[PDB]
Amino acid sequence: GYFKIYSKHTPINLVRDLPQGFSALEPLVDLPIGINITRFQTLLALHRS
Amino acid sequence: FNGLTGTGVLTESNKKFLPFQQFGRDIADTTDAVRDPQTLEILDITPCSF
């Protein structure tokens, strides 16, 4: 029932390929949501043209 | 501390827990250090010398 969000910023030389070096993720905070999650989706910020 | 009772000398901590982390327990499972509840300052736990 605890959800943790991890943020790591690593400079990447390759345009898309992930870096060989290990990246250590750090959780900002621990939140007791108490509800199991089985689906996730990303959010897009889009502006009118 | 937070309903957990231990007997040891209390000293300030050079080490710093991450914000999510509140306590540190060693390999024996004894608490290595306790972060103060009222203010977020890490306190090292050293058992009284025997």
Curated annotation (Swiss-Prot), chain A:
<feature type="glycosylation site" description="N-linked (GlcNAc...) (high mannose) asparagine; by host">
    <location>
        <position position="36"/>
    </location>
</feature>
<protein>
    <recommendedName>
        <fullName>Spike protein S1</fullName>
    </recommendedName>
</protein>
<comment type="subunit">
    <text>Binds to host ACE2. RBD also interacts with the N-linked glycan on 'Asn-90' of ACE2. Cleavage of S generates a polybasic C-terminal sequence on S1 that binds to host Neuropilin-1 (NRP1) and Neuropilin-2 (NRP2) receptors. Interacts with host integrin alpha-5/beta-1 (ITGA5:ITGB1) and with ACE2 in complex with integrin alpha-5/beta-1 (ITGA5:ITGB1). May interact via cytoplasmic c-terminus with M protein. May interact (via N-terminus) with host bilirubin and biliverdin, thereby preventing antibody binding to the SARS-CoV-2 spike NTD via an allosteric mechanism.</text>
</comment>
<comment type="function">
    <text>Attaches the virion to the cell membrane by interacting with host receptor, initiating the infection. The major receptor is host ACE2. When S2/S2' has been cleaved, binding to the receptor triggers direct fusion at the cell membrane. When S2/S2' has not been cleaved, binding to the receptor results in internalization of the virus by endocytosis using host TFRC and GRM2 and leading to fusion of the virion membrane with the host endosomal membrane. Alternatively, may use NRP1/NRP2 and integrin as entry receptors.</text>
</comment>
